[PDB]
Amino acid sequence: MELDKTKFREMYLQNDSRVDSYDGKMEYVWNGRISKDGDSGGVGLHTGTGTKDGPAVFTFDLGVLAKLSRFALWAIQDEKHFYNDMSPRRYEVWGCATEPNPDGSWDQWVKLLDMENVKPSGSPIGILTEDDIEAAKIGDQANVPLDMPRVRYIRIKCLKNWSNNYNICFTELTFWG
Amino acid sequence: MELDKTKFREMYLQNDSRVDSYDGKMEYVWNGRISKDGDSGGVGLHTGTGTKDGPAVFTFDLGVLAKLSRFALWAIQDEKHFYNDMSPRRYEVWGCATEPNPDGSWDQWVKLLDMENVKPSGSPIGILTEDDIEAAKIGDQANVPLDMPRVRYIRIKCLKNWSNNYNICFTELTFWG
Ligand SMILES: [Ca+2]
Ligand SMILES: [Ca+2]
């Protein structure tokens, strides 16, 4: 099944990135809307454009203990953001089963997924083919390996975005399990 | 019993006030620390000083369904904030038992408590007695009536703060039940 996004909850551990730049909010990435700039109802989350010391990190609660099967993520749905801007290019999804320590340490977390947003055409930043746009509307898609433990809490870490920095912005994610 | 603050979670319903001014964050009002400006570890939440159209409102999840018995709230613990600044003066606590509608409507919520932060000395703003200080370390304190329903979700509405507007800032709250 698709996990029930009405149960998802923002968390904030020490050293996590704020995600509320450009009127963003973490709850906007589980509002069931895959949005673009100018849409109503909260477009997505956004850490900003300022330098960071390392990869952006944020944390949330699925509200259920689940055996995960699949994961998807969508960039904000316009040319400004497709394979561009602060959209994520290399990123990770991590999980754990018991309450996250508020100090934000990685110790208890397990890495579920190594994600790469691949641009089908491989065109330079700012050029898009019809296949690049199609892929962006499908979203990044992954199956979670069967050996992963059941998890309830999630972290996303942005290793690099499409502008070669550590910020991240996007519109929606979905979990199944 | 004191409700387990490790389980509390921020929510964000449409039209809720952002509470992240001055490096604030909602989770700082259930971190177990009753803090003043300059302290480490997140001082409190703060909606800013912009003029609002109405009472500031924000929402959170207790993480359990509880029969509530008591509520307490502390202002940021220094003379700048005691009966001053954006510290709450008249405010309300509201609750419900089932998932909050994300449209932020009041329809499903029930008002649990009418709170007033009373300044013992009644002195003008900026003047503090020893009694006024002692009361502010003890915090606002209320018993929740036995005829209230069990609730899992909470809203706080700031009708008026000590600067005669709708903003709110404070360092910690506690629920028992
Ligand atoms: Ca969304
Ligand atoms: Ca606190």
Numbering used by the authors:
A (entry chain BBB), B (entry chain AAA): 220 to 396
What does the report in the manuscript say about this coordinate set?
Herein we have identified eight Sus-like systems in B. thetaiotaomicron that share the feature of a homologous SusE-like factor encoded immediately downstream from the transporter/lipoprotein duo susC/D. Two SusE-like proteins from these systems, BT2857 and BT3158, were characterized by X-ray crystallography and BT2857 was further analyzed by small-angle X-ray scattering. The SusE-like proteins were found to be composed of a conserved three domain architecture: a partially disordered N-terminal domain that is predicted to be proximal to the membrane and structurally homologous to an FN3-like bundle, a middle β-sandwich domain, and a C-terminal domain homologous to family 32 carbohydrate-binding modules, that bind to galactose. However, functional analyses with BT2857 and BT3158 revealed that the SusE-like proteins exhibited galactosidase activity with para-nitrophenyl-β-D-galactopyranoside and α-(1,4)-lactose substrates, that has not been demonstrated for SusE proteins. Using a series of domain truncations of BT2857, the predominant β-D-galactosidase activity is suggested to be localized to the C-terminal DUF5126 domain that would be most distal from the outer membrane.
The BT2857C construct crystallized in the P21 space group with two molecules in the asymmetric unit, and high-quality diffraction data was processed to 1.42 Å resolution. The structure of BT2857C adopts a β-sandwich fold with extensive loop regions and high similarity to the equivalent domain of BT3158. Structures of the DUF5000 or Ec domains (BT2857C and BT3158E223–P440) were compared via the MatchMaker in Chimera using the Smith-Waterman algorithm, yielding a RMSD of 1.225 Å across C-alpha atoms, and a quality score of 0.768. There is also high structural similarity of CBM32 with BT2857 (2.015 Å RMSD), including a calcium binding site wherein the calcium is coordinated by the side chains of N250, E391, main chain carbonyl oxygens of Y247, R252, T390, and a water (BT2857 numbering). Intriguingly, crystallographic ethylene glycol (EDO) that was supplemented during crystallization and used as a cryoprotectant was found in an equivalent location in BT2857 and BT3158. However, there is a lack of residue conservation at this site with the exception of a conserved histidine, H265 (BT2857 and BT3158). Notably, while not sequence conserved, the single Ramachandran outlier in BT2857 is D304. D304 is structurally oriented close to a channel occupied by D256, H265, and Y241. In this channel there are three conserved crystallographic ethylene glycol molecules that are present in both molecules in the asymmetric unit and could suggest the position of carbohydrates for modeling purposes. This region is equivalent to the position for carbohydrate accommodation by CBM family 32.
